[model samples]
Target: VLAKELEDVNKWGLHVFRIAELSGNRPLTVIMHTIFQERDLLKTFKIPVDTLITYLMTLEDHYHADVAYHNNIHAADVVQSTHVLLSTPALEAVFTDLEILAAIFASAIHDVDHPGVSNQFLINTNSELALMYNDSSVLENHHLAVGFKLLQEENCDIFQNLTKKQRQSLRKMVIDIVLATDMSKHMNLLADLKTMVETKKVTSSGVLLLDNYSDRIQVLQNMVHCADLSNPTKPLQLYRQWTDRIMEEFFRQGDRERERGMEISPMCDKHNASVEKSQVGFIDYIVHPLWETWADLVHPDAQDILDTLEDNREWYQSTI
Candidate 1:
C-alpha cells in the first residue's frame, strides 16, 4: 500500500502477491517506477517521469487481471526478475545502460493481453491471434504487436524523447528479446546458450566476453527466457502460489476445450491433472538443464537460484 512494502521488491522473492493486493493489482506501475528511477533511465533517456508512469499504467491496464497468472502482476514479477538477472555481479559491466533499459522494457511487455491459454489452444479454436500470426508463436507475436502499437497512443510513448536512431534500435532489440520468449523457441534458445557456455570466451575481468550483436543478443534473449521461467526457482511459498495460479489458468482452458467438445490439453484438466508430478517433470526436463547451464555460465552469480530450483523440485517430489 505504501512505499515500505515496495522495498521488498528489490529482494529476489519480491512477494508479488502482496504487492498485487496493496497496489490495487497494479504492481507493474510501482515496479516500473522504482526500477526505472533506480537505474537513472528516466533522466538518461530524457523521458518525462509522468510520461513514463502514464505509459506503464496504460501498459499494466492492458494485462488482463481475469487471467489468473499472466496478468499485470505477473508482468511486474517478470520485469523485476529480468532486472535481477542483469544485476548479477558476473554481468556487472556486461550490459550497457540502453541494453538494460531495452531488456527491462521487453520483459514488461512480453506477455501483455495474454488470454490464459496456450498457442495450441488458440490455433485449435481458430482465434484471431492464430490467424494473424499464422499459428507460429501466435501469443508471443500478438504480445509484441499490441505493446508496440500502444507506444503510438497519444501522450503514452515513453521513448518519444529518444532520437530516431535510438528509437529504432530499441524497437528492434525489444522485438528480438520479446519474440525470443516464445516457448516453441525454447530448444533453440537453450542450444545457443549452451554453445556459448561451451565455447565461452572470458576476459579475466568478465565471465562473458561479449563482442558483437549476435553474441550480445543471444545472451540477452536467453536471459529473458530464464527470467520468464523463473517462477519455479523462487522461494517455496512463492513457488507454490505460482503453481496454484498456473494450474487454475490451465484448468480454465480445459473448461473451454470441454465446451468446444475438444480434448483437454495436458495439465489443463483439473480432475486429471497431477500438479506435484508435473512440476517434477517440468523441473527435470525444462527448468533444470537450462538453469544448470546458466548457473555454470554465471558460476557463483545465480548459484542460489539454481540451488533453490533443485530445492523446489525436491519439495514438489516429496509432497507427491
Candidate 2:
C-alpha cells in the first residue's frame, strides 16, 4: 500500500497524512529518501545511502510529536510541495542542480524541532532561543543551526566530499532559504517577488531566465514560503485537516498566554476563534495575494493550484 502511494509523491495533491501512516510516522525519512534517490542527489554528492538514511531518521526524531502542528508530517508536506513547485515548466529551466538540492534540503529540514509555538511566544516569554538570537527570527535561526549540527556527526556528513567552495556555496544557499521561511520576513519577501514578476525576463521559448544570484535566491525563497503556507492550496479535505491542526496548535499557545496574563494573539483563542472566518481572512489577506503573485510568475503552469486555492477560500467563506 505504501509503495503504491509513494508513486504519487512527485505529483500535486499528494496525500502526506497517508504517507505518514504507511511509513510508520517517519514520512520525512521516506519522502526525503525518495526525493534524494529520484534526483540522484546521493550519487551526485557522493553520500553513502546508509549514511543519508541515518541522518534523516535522526532528523525525523527531532520533530516534537506533542506539538499539534509543525511536526514531521508538516515538513514532509512542505518538501513535497516544494518539489511540485520546482517542477513548474518555467521554473524547471531556471534552477541549477545545486539550487534544486538546496531548495529540497532546506524545505525538508526547515522546521525541525519546532516547539509548536510561534516565535512571538518565545520572545514574550523570554525563552532561551529568543535570548540567544536577540529576539529576531529565533526559530528560523535554531532550525538552521540544528539541521547543520546534525550533519556534523561523523556518519551523517553527506557533503564531506564537496570542495571548500562548493560547501560554502551550498551552505549559503541553504541558510538563505531556511531563514526566509520566517513569517516576519513574509512582506519583504513578497515585495521582492512582486518586483521580480514585474521585471521578469524570459526567453522566446517562454523559459524563465534569472541571471543573477540575488534574483535566483529570491525566487527560491518564495517557493519555499509558498510551500510553507500551502494548506489552502491542497484539496479541501486536506486543507481543512491542516486548518484544524494549526488552530489547535494556536489555541494551545493561547492557553499559555492566558495563563501568563498576556493578551491573546489573533486566531489563538479557541474560545473566541471563528475558525471559518479566520481561514477566510487568511486566504483573502495573506495567502491569496502571495499565491496570485506566484502564479503570475509561473503563469499557466500553476493555474490549477491557484484555482484550488480560490475554491477553498470561497468554501470557507460560505460555510462560516
Candidate 3:
C-alpha cells in the first residue's frame, strides 16, 4: 500500500491546495498559497472543496487493491488530466463555470472505491453491485453511488452552493460523465467523437461544443476514457509500470475465472497469452481510437504523444 498511500497524499494535498487558492476568502487559502505560487480558473471551483477532497481521499484509502488499474492513483491522475485538458484555450466560451465544475468533480469521483473486479465478474459472481444495478452498468452505478453516499454528510456536500435547479443540472451532467467512463462504452464514445469531428461540430474556440446533452456528455465522457487508457500516452518508464500492474491484476482475475469455470478475457490469462501482443491488441482496438479522438480535441499539444503511442503499438506488433 505504500505506492497508493504516497499517491493519496499527493492528490489530497493538491485538492486542498486547489480548494484554498480558489478564493482568498476561503479558509484554506493561506496554507495553499504558501505552498504554490498561483491559481487558475480551476482554483475557484472549490465550493465545499475541503470536505469533498477529504471524502475522496477517504474513498481512496478504503479501496486499496493490488490491481494497477482502477486504483486511487488513477483517480488522481485523471483529476489532474481533467485540469490540464480544461486549461486549453479551445474550451473557453464553450463551457460555463458549472460545466467545468461538473467535469472536474466527475473525474475525481468516477472510480471511487473500485473493488478491482470487472463488470462481468460482478455480474456473474452475483456481487452486491450486480444485484443493486441488475447487472446494468454494475460497476459504473456502484462507483457513482459510493461517491454520492459520501456527500450525504453535511461537510462533504460539494454542491451545496447550487440552487435546486442547478443541483438537478449537476446531477444530470455528473451522471452522464461518470457512466461514460465505463469500459464497455469505450468504442461507442470514441465513435461518436469521430462523427462529431467529421461533421466539423466544434466551438468557435476550436473545441467540441456541448450545446445539447449528448454533445456535452460526449466530451466529458471521452475525457475520462482517455484518462482511463492513458498508459500509452505516458512516458516510457511510467507506461511500463502501468503495464506491469495491469498484467498482474488481470492474471489474478484469470485465476478467479478458472476456478469459477468461466472463460477468461484474452489478456487475463498471463501464462497463455503474450503480454506484449495483448497490450497491442487492446491499444489497437481501444486505446488508439480513444486517444485519436483526444488528439483531435487538442491537436498539436498531443501530436508527439500520439506518435509515441503509435510507435508503442508497432513495438507490440513486432513482438507478436
Candidate 4:
C-alpha cells in the first residue's frame, strides 16, 4: 500500500510524504490506488486498475488546457488537502473510514487530466466532451469516466470484492464529489457550509453533524471540492512550488488553447505581468476563506497550515 511507502520516505514533512509516497507512478499514486481499491471493494467490477492509476501519472505529459490541468501533481495537492480537512475535530466521529477513504479517492481522480479550461470552454468550443455530456460538467464528467474506463483492463481490478449496493453507493458518492469541484459551484458550496455553521446547526459535540444521506453527501462533496483547490494550505516553500507547477501547467494549456483558437483561461495565459498577483488573487479570492473556515473546524492541528497560508500570502503580496 502507498501508506507503507509513506513510511519509506527519507523526510517526514507533509509535503515530503505526499511527494515521496506518491512519486513512482505520478505523485497522487497512493490516493489513486486507495480510491480504485475502495471502488472495487464496493462493486464486483475489477479491472487492471493499477494501470489506470499509472496512466494518470502521465497526465503532465499530455499537458492540455482543460484535461491536463488535473494531473498527478494536482492529485497530490488534493490528497494533501484531504489530509488537512481530515484533521478537523468536527469530522472525528462524524465521518466513517469509508467516507474518508472515498473523499481522498474522489479528490485523486476528480480532475485526472484537466485541461486549463473550464467546463464552459468545452461547451463553447463544441468540443467532443461537451457533445458527449451535453455540456453538463463536461470536463468533470469526462474525468470520472476516464478514471473508471482504465479499469476495463486486466491486473488493475482494484475493487473486485464488494456487493452491488456498495458499488452503487461508491459510484454515486464519487461522481457527486467530482462534479462539485467546479469553480462556479465554489461560492454556493462554501456558502452552504458557512450557513450551516452560522445557524448553530452543528451537533452537541461541535462536529459538523450529519443525520441522513443528504446531509452526509453534502459535506463529502464540499470536502473533496475544497481539497481540489487547496494549494494555499501548505508550507511557504511547498505552496510556492505548487504555484510554479500550476502556473506552468496553466500556461502550457493556454498556449495550446491559443493554438486551437479557443479562449484562454485568465491566469493560465502567463503574461509578463506578475505571477505573484495571479497567485494572490487565487489565494485571497478562492483558497483562503475556504481554508479559514476549515481550520476553524479543525483548530490547533491546522495551526501550522494556517501559518503557512498567511506567510505564503504575504510572500506574494510582498512581491506584488
Candidate 5:
C-alpha cells in the first residue's frame, strides 16, 4: 500500500497527508529511507540500515503532534521537495554524493523538535533556548543540537562508521545549510543566490559548475530553503490544506498572546486577519522573490512551480 502511494513521491503535488497515514504517521522515515537507498547514500556513507531506521523513527517521534505547521509531516514534505529540486538536471549536475547526503539529511531534520513558535516569541519570553543560543537563530540552533543529541543514543548513530574528517565535513555542511533556513538569514542567502546566478559559470553542456565549497553550499542552502517555503508553490488543493493548517496554528498563537496580554503578531490575530490578503502579500513579498531567484538559477525546471505559485497568488488576490 505504501509502495503504491510512493509513486507520487517525486510529484510536486505529492499528497503527504495520505503518505503520512499510510506510513503510520512515519512520513519522515518513509521518505528519507527511500531517498537514501535511491541515492545510494546508505552504502556510500556506510550507514547501517537498521541503525538509520532506528534514528529516523526516533527523530520523527521528536516532532510535536500539537504543532500544526512545524511537525513531522512538514519535515517529510521538505525532504520530498528537496529531492524534487535536486533531481533537476541543471541543479543535479552540480551536487556531489556527499552534498546530496547533506541536503536530504538537513531537510529531514531541519525542524526536528521545533516548538512551533518564532524566534521573536522565544526571545520575548526569555525561553531557555533563546538564552542558550543568545537569541540568534535559537530554534535553528536547538534543532541542530537536539538532532545530533538523538544520534548519541544506542544503535542510533547512522554516521558512526564514517571517518572523523568525513563526519566533520558532513556536520559542517549540515549546520551551515540548516542555519541558513532561519528567516533572519534569508536576505543574505538570497543575495548570495542572485550573485551566483549573475556570475554563474556553467559548462559547455549548460551544467552548473560550483567548484568552490562556499558556492556549492550556497546553492544547497537556497535549495533547502526553497523546499521549506514551497507550500505556496504547491498545487491548489495541497496549498489550501497548508494555508488552513498554518492559519489554525497562527490563530492559536494569537489566542495565547491575547490571554497573556501580549500584542498579537501580524496575521496571528485571527479576528483581524484577512487570510486571502495575507496569503497574497506573503506570496508577493516573500515566496515569489525567493522562488523567482531559484527559478532563475534552474530555469525551466522550476518554471512549473513558479507557474502554480502565480496561479495560487492570483487566486488569493481575487478573494481579497
Candidate 6:
C-alpha cells in the first residue's frame, strides 16, 4: 500500500497526509531514503546504505509526531518539495551534487523535535532553548546542533566516507540552508532572492549562472526557504489540510497561553481567527510575494505553482 502511494513521491502535489497514513508516520525516513537513493547520493557520497538507514531512522524519531504542524509528515513534505524545486528544468545542472544532498538533508532535519510552539513562546516563557543561545534562532540553532550531532554516532555517520574538504563544505551548506528557514528572516531572504533575480547572470541558453560560493549558497537558501513555506502553493485539498493542521496546532498553543494568562500569539486564538481571512491573507501577503519572485527567478518553471497559489487564494476569498 505504501509502495503504491510512493508513486507520487516526486510530484509537487503529493498527498503527504496519505503518506503519513501509509508509512506508519515514518514518512521522513521513507522520503529521505528514497530521495537520497533516487539522486544516487549514497553512491556519490559513498554513504553505506545501513548507516544511511540507521541515521534516517534516528533522525525521524526526533520529530514530534504529536505536533500537528511540525511533524515527520511536514518534514517529508518539505523534502519532497525541495526535490521538486531542485528538479526544475531550468535549474538542470545548476546545483552541485553536494548542494543537492545538503538541500534534502537540511529539509529533513529542519524542524525535528519541535515543541509545536513558536520561538516567541519559548522566549516569552523563558524556556531553556531561549536561554541556550541567548534567544537567537533558538529552534533553528537547536535543530542544526542536534541534527549534526546525530551524525557523530559511529553507526550513523552518513558522511563518514566524505573527504575532509567535502565534509566541511557539506556541513556548512546544511547549516546555512537550515538556518535560513527561520521565519524571522523571510523578508531578507526574499530581498536577496529578488536582487538575484535581476542581478544574476544567465547563460546564453538561459541557464542560471551561480559561479561563486556566495551566489550558489544564496540560491540554495531561497530554494529551501521556499520549500519550507510552500504549504499554500500546493494543490487546494493539500493546502486546506495543512491549513487545518496549522490551525489546530495554533489552537493548542493558544490554549496553553490562556491557562497561563499570557497573550495568545497572532492567528493562534482559535475563537478569534478567521480561517478564510487568514488563508487569503497568508496567500497574498506572504505566499504570493515570495513565490512570484521565485517564479520570476525560474522563469516558467514555477508558473504552475504560482497558478495553484492564485487558485487557492481565490477559493479562500470566495469562502470569505
Model 6's TM-score against the true structure? 0.98
TM-score of 4: 0.79
| Model 6 Cα RMSD, 1 decimal | 1.1
Residue range 1-320, candidate 2, lDDT tens digits: 99888899889889999999999999999998988888888888887998998889888899998887899999999998998899899876678778998899899889999999899999999999999999999999999999999998768887787779888998999999999999998999999999999998998888888888998899999999999999999999899899989998999999999999999999998889899999999999889999999999999899999999999998999996
In candidate 4, residue 113 scores what lDDT? Answer: 56
Of candidates 6 and 2, the better by lDDT: 2
- The candidate with the higher TM-score, 2 or 3, is 2
How many backbone overlaps does candidate 4 show? Answer: 21
- What is the Å distance of residue 195 in model 1 from its true position? 0.6
Say which candidate scores most in lDDT. Answer: 2
Residues 13-39, candidate 5, lDDT per residue (tens digit)? 788998999999999999888878887
lDDT of candidate 1 over 164-228, digit per residue (tens): 98888888999999999999898999998999999988789875689999999888998899989
Q: How accurate is candidate 2 locally (lDDT)?
A: 0.91
RMSD of each: 1.1, 0.9, 6.4, 4.7, 1.1, 1.1
lDDT of each: 0.89, 0.91, 0.67, 0.65, 0.90, 0.89
Q: How well does each candidate superpose onto the true structure, as a TM-score? A: 0.98, 0.98, 0.82, 0.79, 0.97, 0.98
Worst 10 residues of 5 by lDDT: 89-98
Predicted candidate 6 versus true structure: per-residue lDDT over 1-320, tens digit per residue? 78777778778988888887888878888888888888889998899999998998899889987899998889999999999999997788998898898899899999988989999999999999999979899999999998999998769999899889988999999999988999999999999999998886788778888889988888889998999889989988889889999999999999999889999998889879899998888878888999999999899888999999888898899997
The runs of at least 3 residues in candidate 5 whose Cα sits more than 4 Å from the true structure, single-residue gaps closed, are none
Compared with the true structure, model 5 gives a TM-score of: 0.97
Deviation (Å) of 199 in candidate 5: 1.3
Instruction: Give per-candidate clash totals.
Output: 0, 0, 1, 21, 0, 0
